[PDB]
Amino acid sequence: SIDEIYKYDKKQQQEILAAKPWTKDHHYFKYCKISALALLKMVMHARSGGNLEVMGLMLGKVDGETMIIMDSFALPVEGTETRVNAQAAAYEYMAAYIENAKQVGRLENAIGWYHSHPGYGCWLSGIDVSTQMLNQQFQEPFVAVVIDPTRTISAGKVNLGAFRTYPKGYKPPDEGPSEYQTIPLNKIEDFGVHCKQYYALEVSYFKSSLDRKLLELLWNKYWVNTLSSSSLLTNADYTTGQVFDLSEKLEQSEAQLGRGSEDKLAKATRDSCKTTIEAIHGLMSQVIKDKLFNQINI
Amino acid sequence: PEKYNNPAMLHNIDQEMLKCIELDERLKAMDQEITVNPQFVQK
Amino acid sequence: IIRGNQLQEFAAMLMPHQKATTADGSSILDRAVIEHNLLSASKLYNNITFEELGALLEIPAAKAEKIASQMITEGRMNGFIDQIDGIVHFETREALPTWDKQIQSLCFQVNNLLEKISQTAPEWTAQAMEAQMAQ
Amino acid sequence: IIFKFYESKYASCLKMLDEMKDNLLLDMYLAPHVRTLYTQIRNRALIQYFSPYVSADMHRMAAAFNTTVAALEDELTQLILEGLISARVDSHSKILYARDVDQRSTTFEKSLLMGKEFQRRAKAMMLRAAVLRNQIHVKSP
Amino acid sequence: EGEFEKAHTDFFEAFKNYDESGSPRRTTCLKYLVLANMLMKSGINPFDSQEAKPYKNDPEILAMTNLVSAYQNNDITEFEKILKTNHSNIMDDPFIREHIEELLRNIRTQVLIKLIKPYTRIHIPFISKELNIDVADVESLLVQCILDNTIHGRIDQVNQLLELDHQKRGGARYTALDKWTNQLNSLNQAVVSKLA
Amino acid sequence: SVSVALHPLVILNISDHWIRMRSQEGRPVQVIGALIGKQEGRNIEVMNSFELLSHTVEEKIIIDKEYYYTKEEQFKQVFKELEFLGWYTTGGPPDPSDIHVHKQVCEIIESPLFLKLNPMTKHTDLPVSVFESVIDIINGEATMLFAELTYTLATEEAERIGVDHVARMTNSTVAEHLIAQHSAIKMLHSRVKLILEYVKASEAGEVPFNHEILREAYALCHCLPVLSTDKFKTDFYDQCNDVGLMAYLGTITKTCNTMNQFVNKFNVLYDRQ
Amino acid sequence: MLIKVKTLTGKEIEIDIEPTDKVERIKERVEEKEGIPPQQQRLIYSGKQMNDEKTAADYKILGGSVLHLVLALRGG
Amino acid sequence: NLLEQFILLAKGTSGSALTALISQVLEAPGVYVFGELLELANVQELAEGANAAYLQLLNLFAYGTYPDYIANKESLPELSTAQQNKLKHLTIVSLASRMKCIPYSVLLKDLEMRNLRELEDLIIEAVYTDIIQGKLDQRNQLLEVDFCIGRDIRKKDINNIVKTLHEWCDGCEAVLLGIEQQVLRANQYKENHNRTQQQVEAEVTNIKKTLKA
Ligand SMILES: CC(C)n1nc(C(F)F)cc1C(=O)Nc1ccc([C@H]2[C@@H](O)CCCc3cncn32)c(-c2ccccc2)c1
Ligand SMILES: [Zn+2]
């Protein structure tokens, strides 16, 4: 049944952990499945973080070649993108929360960590890469999840990326798709330097039978918020920041044209196209709303 | 003179965008001719 | 809004001991009632002149202005005072968010009406819903 | 002089500056720069006088700067045209009104002008490409 | 003379020296101590010493204490009434007279700043009525405060009022659009000039 | 009587809790949990919800106050501005066991709420119900019972996007945007057409004449057009012109890029080096 | 004495320690057993981070306990 | 629902009892729509006789206004302060039904109020009765209504209801058709551009291949 995935097999998990097959291979984990509740909690926490960054922990299991995530819990850190982990407050919090959840019925174990990159894409920086490398070196398995709560609102689709790094000294053989991601100027050097040390798993979402029934029952009352959204007002500081970054990139492209990585004008054009398309979508939504509601003069 | 909150100004901006779009389309059309030029295959 | 006659009735019903009044005036109950009246009128007016606020609160216009300014400074209520026109301005209710709220209210009305229809003629609404997909 | 300039006693400050100018002109290394320094000081005083005001009366300004209303009007015009004062004179009631510029209309105007210039330049260079391809040039005979 | 902060630090060090060594001189040193306390307005603990309270409660010398209480409370009427009512204690000492001006101006400035908060356009005669000074004094104080960037507003001289800026618009969007337009202009010029 | 705003995260938490417990124990079993939210005046809003640990002796259920307090400290560590609101359970109509657990919970807060979710339901509407405690005197005896409240689904952009993505789980861009708007407009059309049919059927004569429904239909018809005022029109045109200028600048940038590519190719072709 | 040691991920290590051993001694025991350097290591007992130096028996050896282990990255 | 109780207790009454009950229900606070009482066959039969004035009063309270009452003051029986207040509230609701930003002048003219304070107090009372939700604007002399209850309807009014709902359905259908057409056009444009680019690349590859040989 669909709820079969919700059954936790302690014996099978112990057997898989004790018969680790990921050691012989390196790209062993290729699929990453996320429950509906975990994804929703991650997105709401990243959004409520605001403009700052938030990070939590993820509880799941493994089934052969795929990595399943069932739950996620935040940890305080006072957020504010502190230097790194914690003044030991989060260090106590992780163990305390796991122990408390053990005696209730949350009998799954940690599988990774998630954090937010609000406004500048979904990737692993240098410190993130070092953290994931260290975690995978000792406690295995482990997956990093990066969310973009601002681009999610702006584009209408969730911006979630699951990543896993490579061992020290390992040179992956080509096979780089490298789809384009807009990244500001002040955060481009780190992305360029630390880009071949990790790979992105294919992420899919799942939900239970009761969850599906409840969502299909809830849509009958939730259809209002789609028609009363007005996305052009909630995201204006983000658009202003995007325009500032685009102007700086255009200045750099003009400097390269005057002088004597490659063709920065094309990248600036793609960024401008993305921003303008988002703005026009926001406007046409309001045009549709006006046509629906303001013209039906009794 | 005016504040920019009129359908007339909206139409003016629309006309300017239409002219720019036509300009770019012609640019691309005359660029592809150079692209498929045999002389523009040796270099 | 608590009226002066109701306040007087409550004062008459109250025991003499409970009427704790400051020496300079402005008995505690009357001050609390005036502040409550101002805070409740904040929910009813876009902007109100000093004369009408004084008539509403049954106090002189100068005292009304002073109390409103003190309440605004202390952060209890939101607004700003235009002294030249003698007008206190409460919240603004911008046009586009008002449009969003009214669209939400209209859709809520549609939903409630559909529920009431389906709770009165169940067989008819079942037949209509069944024919809705076919037609 | 410096204290009265700081605490906005412009009439007295300028009067004592004019008193001291005659002795200052006989110096060695400051005689050439006296005129420039005095002009800069007076312009700074004029700009600082109008800083806190949104609608200033020109009679009081003229009285405080030891000049007639007509001379003050001419000086204000010269300052508004180029320098730091952003204001408009009203010579009916003789009042200087601060001018607040709206950003929206200005940006719209400048963007439309830039678009027009860009389109004209693109058309011109398209013609230039055509003539360059066709090899049109002026020969000696 | 009193050369600002250097003279202030010299005064604190001298007063500390005369407190450690000149014990019997406290009878007249306490006035200077409280004056220095209101000049710094940072310690705001002149009554911390419990030994001074029994000698202060004697009614012969209480003008300093009531001045401190009025100054901390930030009310002008009590300060002025005590100053003019109290005699042969305050106005006769040049070392107090030369510094009473800033003392009286600080409370007026603070009261004006607190008063100005809720209003958007407020008359100058109203401020003059509240601060108990003439209209010209109010205008001078407002000009000095506005130039010092302590009061955000501008004076309308013709109508004799002042209007404070409370509305904030989204100018960042238009600044970004201006930057984008300028960069586009420069880039277009360069791209056109490339062909030759 | 307080207005209640619900969040789909709470419903998802409850449903996942019930499904997990059922799968773990082999057979369905009821669960008891706690809610978290914010109260502003008379507006109560729920945001998240964790699970409480309970034991049964004889036929009575007791909540571990020590575990509750440790969880309260833990959640106050993270969500600083959030507070306790009430408890939730899975089942049908309220029972004396529910009244007993509510009496137990009432020793913690003043007026805790009570949420009830029904996993096994046959109706068309959401099985979530919200109750509050009311103490009354019946036949000279003091008993505390339940009063049902009306709740509305709260609005949040990230929540809406996440819920829509989870519900849908599915080659252009305008495509996707317009498809979402289409789904919602379709729901509106269906509903308005069913209402028009009832009204037309009632007018011609097919169903008993109902006055309340017809009056509400008249009130609904009198609500259009929405916000036809001059200030709204000015704001709308402001937004339209702003987006138009942004589109103009984007078009200019794209044309500049195409121009640069053409100039490069022309220089490579028609130059002798 | 011997005390399974469990990390957050779920791995448990069967390790041999003496009651008179100190927290630093257990840390280097874990270093030899697994490989984690004794600075990227935090042991937490009963929801409490031990102040290294403080011996161990004090804290509370009580035989088969389970000291919770969480990694760290020193500075970098 | 007081109207249900009044209907239940009105079965056996007639004549003077009926008129007294009508006066009581009109004066009763809370009830603002009288449709079932007017629908009663006995009440509709009260027309024949000397008590048609009470039926006319009930009709005025169901569908009527204060100017209508003033124009027909002599025929109708005298009303107390509570009934006049209810009629003024219903007049405000009737105005707000068709206008969503009501000026002060029309309200003053309709309700025959003299000073602004009385009118504003009346509007505040109407707001507090939870029968009209809005805000009062003194600077512009406006009352902005966000919500107003639906008043009583006639048998011939339903044509407007069906016409408005038909117009709304037609608008929704037109919007859906436009969305479908726009999606189709965008997809066709994208596929056409991709095909043209692929064809150009293929031609370039063919030219390079035949040139390099
Ligand atoms: C799994 C967690 C607890 N963790 N384990 C280990 C490892 F030592 F075990 C180490 C860690 C761990 O907290 N890492 C970490 C590193 C850096 C940041 C910040 C940091 O750069 C500051 C700028 C913002 C930023 C953008 N991208 C990473 N950051 C964070 C972090 C992210 C969001 C909120 C709070 C903190 C966490
Ligand atoms: Zn990061």
PDB file of N, CA, C and O and ligand atoms in Angstrom, chain A residues 53-55 57 75 77 79 81-85 91 94 113 115-117 120 125 127-128 131 134-135 139 142, chain G residues 71-73, ligand 1:
ATOM      1  N   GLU A  53      19.178  33.602   7.404  1.00  0.00           N
ATOM      2  CA  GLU A  53      19.292  32.187   7.090  1.00  0.00           C
ATOM      3  C   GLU A  53      18.903  31.351   8.302  1.00  0.00           C
ATOM      4  O   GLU A  53      19.169  31.735   9.444  1.00  0.00           O
ATOM      5  N   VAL A  54      18.262  30.213   8.046  1.00  0.00           N
ATOM      6  CA  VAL A  54      17.885  29.271   9.090  1.00  0.00           C
ATOM      7  C   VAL A  54      18.340  27.880   8.681  1.00  0.00           C
ATOM      8  O   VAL A  54      18.461  27.570   7.493  1.00  0.00           O
ATOM      9  N   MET A  55      18.599  27.036   9.677  1.00  0.00           N
ATOM     10  CA  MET A  55      19.058  25.679   9.419  1.00  0.00           C
ATOM     11  C   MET A  55      18.475  24.739  10.461  1.00  0.00           C
ATOM     12  O   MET A  55      18.333  25.107  11.629  1.00  0.00           O
ATOM     13  N   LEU A  57      17.446  20.095  10.920  1.00  0.00           N
ATOM     14  CA  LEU A  57      17.913  18.732  10.734  1.00  0.00           C
ATOM     15  C   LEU A  57      16.781  17.908  10.145  1.00  0.00           C
ATOM     16  O   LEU A  57      15.608  18.265  10.267  1.00  0.00           O
ATOM     17  N   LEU A  75      16.398  23.798  14.551  1.00  0.00           N
ATOM     18  CA  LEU A  75      17.177  24.015  15.757  1.00  0.00           C
ATOM     19  C   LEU A  75      17.511  25.494  15.865  1.00  0.00           C
ATOM     20  O   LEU A  75      17.725  26.159  14.847  1.00  0.00           O
ATOM     21  N   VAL A  77      19.753  28.158  17.007  1.00  0.00           N
ATOM     22  CA  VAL A  77      20.942  28.896  16.573  1.00  0.00           C
ATOM     23  C   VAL A  77      20.745  30.411  16.633  1.00  0.00           C
ATOM     24  O   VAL A  77      21.642  31.176  16.258  1.00  0.00           O
ATOM     25  N   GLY A  79      19.635  31.739  14.731  1.00  0.00           N
ATOM     26  CA  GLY A  79      19.687  32.022  13.306  1.00  0.00           C
ATOM     27  C   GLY A  79      20.731  33.048  12.966  1.00  0.00           C
ATOM     28  O   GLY A  79      21.903  32.884  13.308  1.00  0.00           O
ATOM     29  N   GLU A  81      22.498  33.613  10.595  1.00  0.00           N
ATOM     30  CA  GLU A  81      23.712  33.144   9.950  1.00  0.00           C
ATOM     31  C   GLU A  81      24.939  33.273  10.846  1.00  0.00           C
ATOM     32  O   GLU A  81      25.905  33.942  10.498  1.00  0.00           O
ATOM     33  N   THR A  82      24.922  32.613  11.990  1.00  0.00           N
ATOM     34  CA  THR A  82      26.066  32.679  12.870  1.00  0.00           C
ATOM     35  C   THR A  82      27.275  32.049  12.215  1.00  0.00           C
ATOM     36  O   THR A  82      27.155  31.414  11.173  1.00  0.00           O
ATOM     37  N   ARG A  83      28.439  32.199  12.831  1.00  0.00           N
ATOM     38  CA  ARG A  83      29.687  31.695  12.239  1.00  0.00           C
ATOM     39  C   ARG A  83      29.612  30.270  11.735  1.00  0.00           C
ATOM     40  O   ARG A  83      30.151  29.957  10.681  1.00  0.00           O
ATOM     41  N   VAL A  84      28.963  29.405  12.491  1.00  0.00           N
ATOM     42  CA  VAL A  84      28.858  28.020  12.108  1.00  0.00           C
ATOM     43  C   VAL A  84      27.818  27.371  12.977  1.00  0.00           C
ATOM     44  O   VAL A  84      26.725  27.898  13.141  1.00  0.00           O
ATOM     45  N   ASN A  85      28.138  26.208  13.540  1.00  0.00           N
ATOM     46  CA  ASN A  85      27.161  25.469  14.354  1.00  0.00           C
ATOM     47  C   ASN A  85      26.660  26.231  15.577  1.00  0.00           C
ATOM     48  O   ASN A  85      25.834  27.126  15.434  1.00  0.00           O
ATOM     49  N   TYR A  91      24.058  22.134  19.919  1.00  0.00           N
ATOM     50  CA  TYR A  91      24.703  20.850  20.173  1.00  0.00           C
ATOM     51  C   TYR A  91      23.920  20.041  21.196  1.00  0.00           C
ATOM     52  O   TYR A  91      23.782  18.820  21.061  1.00  0.00           O
ATOM     53  N   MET A  94      20.011  19.201  19.481  1.00  0.00           N
ATOM     54  CA  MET A  94      19.814  18.067  18.578  1.00  0.00           C
ATOM     55  C   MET A  94      19.576  16.780  19.356  1.00  0.00           C
ATOM     56  O   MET A  94      18.599  16.060  19.112  1.00  0.00           O
ATOM     57  N   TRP A 113      20.994  17.389   6.659  1.00  0.00           N
ATOM     58  CA  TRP A 113      20.738  18.707   7.219  1.00  0.00           C
ATOM     59  C   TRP A 113      20.286  19.643   6.113  1.00  0.00           C
ATOM     60  O   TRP A 113      20.688  19.501   4.957  1.00  0.00           O
ATOM     61  N   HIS A 115      19.252  23.882   5.037  1.00  0.00           N
ATOM     62  CA  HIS A 115      19.384  25.295   5.354  1.00  0.00           C
ATOM     63  C   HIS A 115      18.925  26.115   4.156  1.00  0.00           C
ATOM     64  O   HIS A 115      18.661  25.587   3.071  1.00  0.00           O
ATOM     65  N   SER A 116      18.807  27.417   4.378  1.00  0.00           N
ATOM     66  CA  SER A 116      18.207  28.319   3.414  1.00  0.00           C
ATOM     67  C   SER A 116      19.255  29.253   2.831  1.00  0.00           C
ATOM     68  O   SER A 116      20.190  29.676   3.513  1.00  0.00           O
ATOM     69  N   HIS A 117      19.078  29.571   1.553  1.00  0.00           N
ATOM     70  CA  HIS A 117      19.932  30.501   0.820  1.00  0.00           C
ATOM     71  C   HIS A 117      19.000  31.536   0.209  1.00  0.00           C
ATOM     72  O   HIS A 117      18.762  31.536  -1.005  1.00  0.00           O
ATOM     73  N   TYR A 120      19.762  33.939  -3.310  1.00  0.00           N
ATOM     74  CA  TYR A 120      20.957  33.698  -4.114  1.00  0.00           C
ATOM     75  C   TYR A 120      21.129  32.213  -4.416  1.00  0.00           C
ATOM     76  O   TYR A 120      22.205  31.639  -4.250  1.00  0.00           O
ATOM     77  N   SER A 125      28.227  26.273  -0.689  1.00  0.00           N
ATOM     78  CA  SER A 125      29.386  27.152  -0.667  1.00  0.00           C
ATOM     79  C   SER A 125      30.592  26.377  -0.140  1.00  0.00           C
ATOM     80  O   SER A 125      30.544  25.158   0.040  1.00  0.00           O
ATOM     81  N   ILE A 127      32.108  26.583   2.907  1.00  0.00           N
ATOM     82  CA  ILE A 127      31.890  26.087   4.260  1.00  0.00           C
ATOM     83  C   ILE A 127      30.856  24.969   4.261  1.00  0.00           C
ATOM     84  O   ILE A 127      30.988  23.985   4.997  1.00  0.00           O
ATOM     85  N   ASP A 128      29.819  25.088   3.427  1.00  0.00           N
ATOM     86  CA  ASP A 128      28.832  24.018   3.320  1.00  0.00           C
ATOM     87  C   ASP A 128      29.463  22.741   2.787  1.00  0.00           C
ATOM     88  O   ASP A 128      29.164  21.641   3.268  1.00  0.00           O
ATOM     89  N   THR A 131      31.504  21.181   5.519  1.00  0.00           N
ATOM     90  CA  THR A 131      30.631  20.575   6.520  1.00  0.00           C
ATOM     91  C   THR A 131      30.092  19.233   6.043  1.00  0.00           C
ATOM     92  O   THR A 131      30.111  18.241   6.781  1.00  0.00           O
ATOM     93  N   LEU A 134      32.883  16.608   5.984  1.00  0.00           N
ATOM     94  CA  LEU A 134      33.166  16.127   7.330  1.00  0.00           C
ATOM     95  C   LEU A 134      32.083  15.179   7.823  1.00  0.00           C
ATOM     96  O   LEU A 134      32.383  14.147   8.434  1.00  0.00           O
ATOM     97  N   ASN A 135      30.815  15.514   7.573  1.00  0.00           N
ATOM     98  CA  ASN A 135      29.725  14.670   8.049  1.00  0.00           C
ATOM     99  C   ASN A 135      29.727  13.314   7.355  1.00  0.00           C
ATOM    100  O   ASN A 135      29.549  12.279   8.006  1.00  0.00           O
ATOM    101  N   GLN A 139      29.818   9.976   9.800  1.00  0.00           N
ATOM    102  CA  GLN A 139      28.468   9.435   9.935  1.00  0.00           C
ATOM    103  C   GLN A 139      27.836   9.363   8.551  1.00  0.00           C
ATOM    104  O   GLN A 139      27.644  10.389   7.892  1.00  0.00           O
ATOM    105  N   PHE A 142      24.287  10.846   4.655  1.00  0.00           N
ATOM    106  CA  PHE A 142      23.990  12.223   5.017  1.00  0.00           C
ATOM    107  C   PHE A 142      23.785  13.009   3.732  1.00  0.00           C
ATOM    108  O   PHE A 142      24.536  12.829   2.773  1.00  0.00           O
TER     109      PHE A 142
ATOM    110  N   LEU G  71      29.494  15.727  16.011  1.00  0.00           N
ATOM    111  CA  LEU G  71      30.726  16.214  15.417  1.00  0.00           C
ATOM    112  C   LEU G  71      30.768  17.740  15.427  1.00  0.00           C
ATOM    113  O   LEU G  71      29.781  18.423  15.711  1.00  0.00           O
ATOM    114  N   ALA G  72      31.944  18.269  15.110  1.00  0.00           N
ATOM    115  CA  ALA G  72      32.164  19.701  14.980  1.00  0.00           C
ATOM    116  C   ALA G  72      33.316  19.896  14.005  1.00  0.00           C
ATOM    117  O   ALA G  72      33.843  18.933  13.445  1.00  0.00           O
ATOM    118  N   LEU G  73      33.625  21.144  13.692  1.00  0.00           N
ATOM    119  CA  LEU G  73      34.657  21.402  12.684  1.00  0.00           C
ATOM    120  C   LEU G  73      35.698  22.345  13.206  1.00  0.00           C
ATOM    121  O   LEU G  73      36.248  23.140  12.455  1.00  0.00           O
TER     122      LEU G  73
HETATM  123  C1  LIG I   1      24.560  19.796  10.419  1.00  0.00           C
HETATM  124  C2  LIG I   1      24.994  21.120  11.032  1.00  0.00           C
HETATM  125  C3  LIG I   1      24.538  21.257  12.478  1.00  0.00           C
HETATM  126  N1  LIG I   1      26.463  21.237  10.962  1.00  0.00           N
HETATM  127  N2  LIG I   1      27.189  20.135  11.134  1.00  0.00           N
HETATM  128  C4  LIG I   1      28.457  20.514  11.021  1.00  0.00           C
HETATM  129  C5  LIG I   1      29.569  19.540  11.157  1.00  0.00           C
HETATM  130  F1  LIG I   1      30.586  20.061  11.906  1.00  0.00           F
HETATM  131  F2  LIG I   1      29.129  18.422  11.843  1.00  0.00           F
HETATM  132  C6  LIG I   1      28.560  21.885  10.767  1.00  0.00           C
HETATM  133  C7  LIG I   1      27.249  22.328  10.726  1.00  0.00           C
HETATM  134  C8  LIG I   1      26.743  23.704  10.504  1.00  0.00           C
HETATM  135  O1  LIG I   1      25.964  24.225  11.294  1.00  0.00           O
HETATM  136  N3  LIG I   1      27.218  24.308   9.376  1.00  0.00           N
HETATM  137  C9  LIG I   1      26.942  25.601   8.894  1.00  0.00           C
HETATM  138  C10 LIG I   1      27.964  26.255   8.207  1.00  0.00           C
HETATM  139  C11 LIG I   1      27.767  27.532   7.716  1.00  0.00           C
HETATM  140  C12 LIG I   1      26.558  28.207   7.882  1.00  0.00           C
HETATM  141  C13 LIG I   1      26.368  29.613   7.347  1.00  0.00           C
HETATM  142  C14 LIG I   1      27.541  30.566   7.638  1.00  0.00           C
HETATM  143  O2  LIG I   1      28.521  30.397   6.616  1.00  0.00           O
HETATM  144  C15 LIG I   1      27.109  32.024   7.777  1.00  0.00           C
HETATM  145  C16 LIG I   1      26.560  32.702   6.523  1.00  0.00           C
HETATM  146  C17 LIG I   1      25.280  32.064   5.965  1.00  0.00           C
HETATM  147  C18 LIG I   1      25.513  30.767   5.281  1.00  0.00           C
HETATM  148  C19 LIG I   1      25.318  30.373   3.985  1.00  0.00           C
HETATM  149  N4  LIG I   1      25.684  29.055   3.823  1.00  0.00           N
HETATM  150  C20 LIG I   1      26.093  28.658   5.008  1.00  0.00           C
HETATM  151  N5  LIG I   1      26.011  29.654   5.925  1.00  0.00           N
HETATM  152  C21 LIG I   1      25.532  27.552   8.581  1.00  0.00           C
HETATM  153  C22 LIG I   1      24.201  28.167   8.831  1.00  0.00           C
HETATM  154  C23 LIG I   1      23.235  28.280   7.829  1.00  0.00           C
HETATM  155  C24 LIG I   1      22.003  28.856   8.095  1.00  0.00           C
HETATM  156  C25 LIG I   1      21.716  29.326   9.369  1.00  0.00           C
HETATM  157  C26 LIG I   1      22.666  29.216  10.376  1.00  0.00           C
HETATM  158  C27 LIG I   1      23.897  28.638  10.107  1.00  0.00           C
HETATM  159  C28 LIG I   1      25.734  26.265   9.076  1.00  0.00           C
END
